[PDB]
Amino acid sequence: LNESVLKVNELNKTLSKKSTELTEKEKEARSTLDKSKQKYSLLIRDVEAIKTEMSNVQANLD
Amino acid sequence: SKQKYSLLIRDVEAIKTEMSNVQANLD
């Protein structure tokens, strides 16, 4: 039980990191539009690739 | 424009992923 508590407490830092990286990538994407198709597309695939990683972590935590 | 573009590019990549699976199976 102690190890499981530690494991969830550590999954929270990855949820936090992918929140951060998603925010950063979204800012980059908006910068791309302001200035293009391929960089914007790649950042958007990523932005979604990170949210998928987030949902897995949320299910595991639950 | 942001949301429609995003949904369409994810869908395009999804389709390309489906394509690569079919190509490996065919090979």
Residue A31 touches chain B, beta carbons under 8 Å: no
As a whole number of angstroms, the distance between CA B19 and CA B14 comes to: 9
Pair of tokens at residue A30:
């908006």
As a whole number of angstroms, the distance between CA A43 and CA A5 comes to: 34
DSSP A62: -
**Distance between first and last Cα of chain A:** 15
DSSP A35: -
Question: Which among A30, A33, A44 has CB closest to B9?
Answer: A44
Is B9 in Cβ contact with A33 (below 8 Å)? no
Determination approach:
cryo-EM
**Which run of H or E residues covers position A59?**
helix A37-61
